[PDB]
Amino acid sequence: EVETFAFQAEIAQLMSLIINTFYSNKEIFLRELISNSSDALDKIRYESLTDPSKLDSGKELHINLIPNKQDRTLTIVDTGIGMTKADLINNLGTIAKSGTKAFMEALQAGADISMIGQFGVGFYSAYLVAEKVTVITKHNDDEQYAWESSAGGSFTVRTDTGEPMGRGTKVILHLKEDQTEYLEERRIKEIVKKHSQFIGYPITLFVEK
């Protein structure tokens, strides 16, 4: 059972701007998503200080980067707090509405796309390099869900029946045909070193077989 939803108008407008604006500095998408993973790890780490049982679904706090040249995907996995169904459908977008409005006004006044994370909506920078984004996620308080969008104004949410995840979020970037540099081991290492060197969790770049 798959449910289809319209993005809020402001968010569809932002994703169209991200997809259609000429902007060569696309590598910042990786910084934004690692930053989001780090925040999610911070949250479950803090919650576990007063309720240790929150780590029953997995004690390791880490980020894995998994390029796949055959599928042309780059996957960013974290074992952070995860997202509920309400997060995916309503809560995160409600928050994103005001950050989007502020980011688009800032762009009008001279900001550039790389400051997108200062407005809390860096997630959407995934569409700099991906034609489709799938997000698999499991929060301690909810079931495992898959969120997916190729932009165009809509997204889907379904119960996920793939491999159980324990807890956390997996962002699967289905890369555009001309963006396969982000599957190359040395390019990814360069970007992580440049932008994410001080992230406080182990980042493991998987190599392909």
Q: Which residues bind ligand A1AXV (CB under 6 A)?
A: 88, 92-93, 96, 121, 123, 135, 147
User: Rounded to an integer, what distance in angstroms lies between the CA atom of residue 89 and that of residue 147?
Assistant: 9
Nearer of residues 91 and 204 to ligand A1AXV, judged by Cβ: 91
Q: Which sign, positive or negative, has the C-alpha torsion 209, 203, 40, 21?
A: negative
User: Is there a binding annotation on residue 97?
Assistant: yes
Nearer of residues 118 and 208 to ligand A1AXV, judged by Cβ: 118
Query: Measuring CA to CA, which residue among 32, 15, 162, 143 is closest to residue 88?
Result: 143
Nearer of residues 142 and 181 to ligand A1AXV, judged by Cβ: 142
Compute the least distance from the CB of residue 97 to ligand A1AXV, in Å: 10
Nearer of residues 29 and 123 to ligand A1AXV, judged by Cβ: 123
| Amino acid at residue number 25 | N
Neighbours of 181 (CB within 10 A): 14
Helix (H) or strand (E) segment spanning residue 5: strand 2-6
CB 136 within 8 A of CB 156: no
Compute the least distance from the CB of residue 38 to ligand A1AXV, in Å: 14
CB 11 within 8 A of CB 154: no
User: Is there a binding annotation on residue 132?
Assistant: no
User: Is there a binding annotation on residue 123?
Assistant: yes
Residue nearest to ligand A1AXV (CB): 92
User: Is there a binding annotation on residue 194?
Assistant: no
Residues making up the annotated binding site are 36, 78, 97, 123
Indicate the annotated binding residues for ATP.
36, 78, 97, 123
